[PDB]
Amino acid sequence: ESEAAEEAVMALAALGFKEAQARAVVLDLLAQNPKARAQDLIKEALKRLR
Amino acid sequence: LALRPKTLDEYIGQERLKQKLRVYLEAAKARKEPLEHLLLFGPPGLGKTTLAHVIAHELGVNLRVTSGPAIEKPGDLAAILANSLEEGDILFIDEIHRLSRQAEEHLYPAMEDFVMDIVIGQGPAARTIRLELPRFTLIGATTRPGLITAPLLSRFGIVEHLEYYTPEELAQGVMRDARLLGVRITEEAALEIGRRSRGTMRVAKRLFRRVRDFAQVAGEEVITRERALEALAALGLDELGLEKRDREILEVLILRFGGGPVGLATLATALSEDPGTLEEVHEPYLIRQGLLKRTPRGRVATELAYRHLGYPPPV
Numbered sequence: 001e002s003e004a005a006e007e008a009v010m011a012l013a014a015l016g017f018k019e020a021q022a023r024a025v026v027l028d029l030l031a032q033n034p035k036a037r038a039q040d041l042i043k044e045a046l047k048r049l050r
Numbered sequence: 051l052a053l054r055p056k057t058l059d060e061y062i063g064q065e066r067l068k069q070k071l072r073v074y075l076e077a078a079k080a081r082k083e084p085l086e087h088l089l090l091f092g093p094p095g096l097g098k099t100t101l102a103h104v105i106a107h108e109l110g111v112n113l114r115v116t117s118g119p120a121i122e123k124p125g126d127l128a129a130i131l132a133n134s135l136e137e138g139d140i141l142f143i144d145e146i147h148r149l150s151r152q153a154e155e156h157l158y159p160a161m162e163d164f165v166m167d168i169v170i171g172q173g174p175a176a177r178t179i180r181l182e183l184p185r186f187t188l189i190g191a192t193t194r195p196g197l198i199t200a201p202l203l204s205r206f207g208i209v210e211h212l213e214y215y216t217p218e219e220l221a222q223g224v225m226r227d228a229r230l231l232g233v234r235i236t237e238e239a240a241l242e243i244g245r246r247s248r249g250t251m252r253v254a255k256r257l258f259r260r261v262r263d264f265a266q267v268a269g270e271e272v273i274t275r276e277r278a279l280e281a282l283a284a285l286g287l288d289e290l291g292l293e294k295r296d297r298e299i300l301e302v303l304i305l306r307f308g309g310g311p312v313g314l315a316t317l318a319t320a321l322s323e324d325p326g327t328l329e330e331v332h333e334p335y336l337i338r339q340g341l342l343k344r345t346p347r348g349r350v351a352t353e354l355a356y357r358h359l360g361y362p363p364p365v
């Protein structure tokens with residue numbers, strides 16, 4: 001898959017988000033910009049997660 | 051009804067605190083840019099959050115506001131610390147002593163090196179990912195300094211207490227708050243409200259509402275000592291600040307129940323009402339006035355409580 005995403009996903013999970021729900025947003029975010037860094041990916045996901 | 055103080059000078063009372071803040075303030079307002087993390091102890095309704103906006107103003111930064119209960123999971127906080135804030139801003143947290151253990155554990159690093167470290171997976175890997183956060187000043191507050199905050203206390207640079215306001219100050223509020231709403235009221239009038247306000251700014255504004263509500267519903271020229279007194283009289287508030295249900299409470303704990311250890315439960319339903327309520331709302335003041343002392347049995351009224359109502363001291 002993608003290093004940046006798996007990283008971003010695990011972190012989101014640690015922060016207490018539904019594992020599955022986190023992956024979907026992270027992955028789509030990744031689709032918008034494949035070269036994103038795990039930090040920006042996480043924050044950018046942090047504001048789309050319930 | 052949407053305007054409050056902005057400059058610290060415009061902030062009423064707390065003179066003791068204003069001097070100390072003014073120092074710590076103008077310092078960082080000159081050095082780098084962030085004010086040290088401030089933890090405010092003190093009773094409710096004293097205007098902590100307003101001090102939050104004021105300080106924010108003094109620095110020329112914005113203010114994010116949240117409560118402990120709200121941060122239901124570290125994420126809730128990471129979201130605020132990573133996106134909600136901008137270099138310099140202040141995040142104020144009310145009831146900060148009810149932060150989820152985890153949540154608090156993630157906060158320490160945030161305050162220290164302005165970074166949040168998240169631990170990925172586990173095992174020998176136990177790798178951690180960090181969220182670079184903006185420099186910010188955390189301003190927490192506890193409706194009860196009573197040790198319920200962890201060692202998170204050691205992460206706070208400043209740590210002060212807001213005190214109850216003298217009725218003159220509370221009055222100074224109603225006063226320079228009415229001119230804002232045009233409303234005509236005379237000094238003493240406001241000051242008569244002060245006396246009734248339980249030393250806390252919250253009740254004052256509230257009471258002034260009620261009083262101005264009942265008032266002008268008959269005239270429009272001016273609220274003077276008399277006008278004020280009659281209004282208060284109508285709503286049923288004695289010089290001591292107790293309300294309609296306040297007397298009724300310590301009342302049913304004398305005639306209906308002998309002046310002896312009644313017992314919360316045996317009092318709530320006893321006079322149709324809830325304990326938590328008649329304990330987390332009415333008992334506080336009644337106690338701070340020495341008219342209802344809690345005993346390791348139930349509830350007991352005091353020789354003063356009887357007096358305020360006009361009964362002879364029974365042995």
Ligand SMILES: Nc1ncnc2c1ncn2[C@@H]1O[C@H](COP(=O)(O)OP(=O)(O)NP(=O)(O)O)[C@@H](O)[C@H]1O
Nearest residue numbers: 054055061062063095096097098099100251252255
């Ligand atoms: N020291 C003060 N000087 C002037 N106005 C004040 C002062 N303190 C409070 N007020 C005003 O009185 C209102 C009600 O007070 P308060 O209940 O303390 O609200 P708050 O400061 O927003 N929140 P909190 O800190 O949780 O109580 C505020 O919204 C202010 O507009």
